[PDB]
Design a binder for this molecule. Structure first.
Ligand SMILES: NC(=O)c1cc2ccccc2n1-c1cccc(C(F)(F)F)c1
Ligand SMILES: [Ca+2]
Ligand SMILES: [Cl-]
Ligand SMILES: [Cl-]
Length: 123
């Protein structure tokens, strides 16, 4: 869930998870448009991952799952079911993605009216 999303992102990366609560066109609840930067691409990818999780019958915003932070890396488990494993994989992925990015302050609280109606496709 959101608790583990924040936790995993904090574990791996250099910055507060507050940094991604409203950033670019995709970091934040929902999102649409051309991603502005690497960070925004990570968030688009995560949005897709969560969409897939929901299509599989999971609740990616709420379900609790166990994980470990070891040397600023996320280890997923123990998993009681497939939803817990899918969710941790999604969050592990974005955490790794964001940890490799430079922050562009100008995209924090970016205006939604500059974000295009359509978005790039999900893998
Ligand atoms: N892919 C995202 O949008 C996203 C990425 C991210 C990273 C750290 C902390 C939060 C983060 N979010 C986010 C922010 C607000 C609401 C939601 C929710 F999952 F509820 F949609 C998700
Ligand atoms: Ca989003
Ligand atoms: Cl910070
Ligand atoms: Cl939603």
């Amino acid at each position: 869930g959101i608790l583990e999303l924040a936790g995993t992102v904090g574990c791996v990366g250099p910055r507060t998870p507050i940094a991604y609560m409203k950033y670019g066109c995709f970091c934040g609840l929902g999102g649409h448009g051309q991603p502005r930067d690497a960070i925004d691409w990570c968030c688009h990818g995560h949005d897709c991952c969560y969409t897939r999780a929901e299509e599989a019958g999971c609740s990616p915003k709420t379900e609790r799952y166990s994980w470990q932070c070891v040397n600023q890396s996320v280890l997923c488990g123990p998993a009681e079911n497939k939803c817990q494993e899918l969710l941790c994989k999604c969050d592990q992925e974005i955490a790794n993605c964001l940890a490799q990015t430079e922050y562009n302050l100008k995209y924090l609280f970016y205006p939604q009216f500059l974000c295009e109606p359509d978005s790039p496709k999900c893998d």
